[PDB]
Ligand binder design. Sequence first.
Ligand SMILES: CNCc1ccc(-c2[nH]c3cc(F)cc4c3c2CCNC4=O)cc1
Length: 345
Amino acid sequence: KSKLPKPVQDLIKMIFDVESMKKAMVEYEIDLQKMPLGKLSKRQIQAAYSILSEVQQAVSQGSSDSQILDLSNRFYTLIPHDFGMKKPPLLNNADSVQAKAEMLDNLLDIEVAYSLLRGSKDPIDVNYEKLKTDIKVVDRDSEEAEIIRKYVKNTHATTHNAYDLEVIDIFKIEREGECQRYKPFKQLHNRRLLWHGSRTTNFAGILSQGLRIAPPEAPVTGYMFGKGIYFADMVSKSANYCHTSQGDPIGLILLGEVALGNMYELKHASHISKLPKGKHSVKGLGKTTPDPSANISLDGVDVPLGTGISSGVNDTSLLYNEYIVYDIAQVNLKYLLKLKFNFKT
Ligand SMILES: CNCc1ccc(-c2[nH]c3cc(F)cc4c3c2CCNC4=O)cc1
């Protein structure tokens, strides 16, 4: 009965895949009986973030093993885990705290996906409408597809040699309310078409609610430029955040129009609470940048699809550029790509 094109139906099945959600939770060693998908709650996850912030503070402060163990046990009480024969890993380093924070980020979007899914017509059409997003297939033979394929081909980083990328499908997307929300930023200068990678299990949340900023209660660990929305001009830097594997080599990646305006240019980590007055974004400066002479205009937006060349910058923490905005209204999502990851083994 569903009149949606086959590629769009396949996308809906992929994003609302309950088996992918359960597999993710098993990998995280979550107790699926004590915290089923339907029992995930914002208030409990909020409280879990706060505890992880206390753990992060305890670890860097060099607190006693007693107070670290206490906080570690409090986290596992809020978010039940099942380690089987193995005892529960002690949360006593920054990497472990960041891994649990990123698990919570993914769990929240899985909760959104499951709540939508269980919230006459073909089930595929019903679930499509719940995304509150217009999704159209971009024709393979179109100049539009040629530009996007070239962006993918040209901006694969030399140091990301674990996989090759193949574009399966290109979708043009329009989130309900996003045009009205973006309107004020639409006439800002320096609008750029940039990559945003995420786990497939996040995309129901991303399409229904848009790209969002980490809450205050989330720990600061791994936010190089503070709590904002991060984008790449190199497809492979973003593609890495799809967290695809040989077992599941199909990923989803966004092209967003980002209203960057006056960029605060940084070479090193700075946890931005407030931009300098007159700045609209941060650019992390990479050693390698898309060749600016190959910059193209797609529907009034700059597409940096040039091959990676040396920037001017040797004295930087970053191999590749990154772009951060601190207002959700500065992003207009344009395309969603289904990518095949061909791992080299
Ligand atoms: C949430 N834990 C800390 C954290 C995790 C991931 C990111 C991040 N940095 C990026 C740079 C970039 F150029 C592109 C991306 C990211 C991300 C994740 C979002 N997606 C990206 O493509 C930033 C902070």
